[PDB]
Symmetry: C2
């Protein structure tokens, strides 16, 4: 396997490092995660922009995480690890408070009511994010899907989160230094709007 | 004119403070009272009054020149469930008792883009408090705007205050919302391209 020869980037045993992720990276830098990494343009780009932040990207499909490891093998970035796990197993990999941020980019919308439970912004997953971040983290979410974003804002509110940032047209707003995904850098810059939100826990 | 409002004092209540806690006696019924801050020409409020006869409506508008037009719409379209007040949002606490108002409507409110004018926005914490002082914890705010900057600010301001977002549309004219009454200004956004944003926010009970 191609994943075995690059086992320094793609970790096959993440559960063994629960509470000890600072020993893997070798520093106490904040750990920011991404659920649904895909081909990895986002995670690799964020890695090069922020060398002093540790990134861990999770992806369900083996066939696509292969391209993500290649992008981290291209750019010398030593601050990115990739895991082939489900979002439900994040609590088996991280201790409460070990993660400082969760990134959700163009997550699967699942518009049908029966599949509300599958949306990465539904209460079940918001609970999993809390269980790995404690009360000191944040969720940075961006999508071009109107329905999912509308649902997400209501879901964040119902759960009791604080909306600290919201952009209803990201491209003609402040491009602080946001890295685009493969899908984002592919479709329109002056067409369909991209929505963005930053939510955190109240203290 | 000031002569027109004095002639039509049954619609344009000149002494609203006198009816504090007694607004049900003005309408002659115990139906819910819903208010609109910044009525303008009054198309929204007259349309809502026509659509919902079982709800009592009170529109407030500071600009005396434009409230005259709002009164004319109520005078012609004989609805008995609409009263209009020539006051500001700060005076709402002198006019209503806690729990007397069940809903606050905000339509295309002044954006006030500049940071130094944040406190003048109808969705700022001060006005949210004024709305709580007339609604208690059992009401809601129904807000519509085309201004991206104001909507974004409002969402964060509603969140900071601890309010619950129950409805949100980021393109109202292409949404499910049936029975949507449009303002004069809203009627041009149908096929211009630019989206109208809408939110319904309530208190946690
Ligand atoms: K994704
Ligand atoms: K909220
Ligand atoms: K208005």
């Amino acid at each position: 396997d191609f994943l075995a020869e690059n086992a320094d980037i793609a970790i096959s045993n993440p559960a063994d490092y629960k509470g000890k992720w600072n020993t893997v990276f070798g520093n106490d830098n904040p750990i920011h995660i991404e659920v649904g990494t895909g081909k990895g343009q986002f995670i690799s780009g964020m890695a090069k922009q922020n060398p002093d932040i540790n990134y861990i990207g999770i992806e369900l499909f083996k066939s696509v995480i292969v391209t993500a490891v290649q992008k981290v093998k291209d750019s010398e970035a030593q601050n990115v690890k990739l895991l082939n796990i489900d979002a439900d197993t994040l609590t088996d990999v991280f201790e409460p408070g070990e993660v400082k941020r969760v990134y959700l980019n163009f997550s699967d919308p699942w518009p049908k009511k029966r599949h509300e439970k599958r949306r990465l912004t539904y209460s079940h997953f918001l609970k999993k994010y809390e269980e790995v971040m404690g009360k000191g983290g944040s969720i940075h979410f961006k999508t071009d899907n109107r329905g999912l974003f509308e649902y997400s804002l209501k879901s964040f509110s119902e759960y009791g989160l604080l909306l600290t940032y919201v952009s209803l047209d990201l491209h003609n707003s402040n491009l602080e230094g946001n890295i685009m995904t493969e899908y984002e850098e592919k479709f329109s810059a002056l067409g369909q709007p991209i929505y963005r939100a930053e939510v955190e826990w109240r203290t």
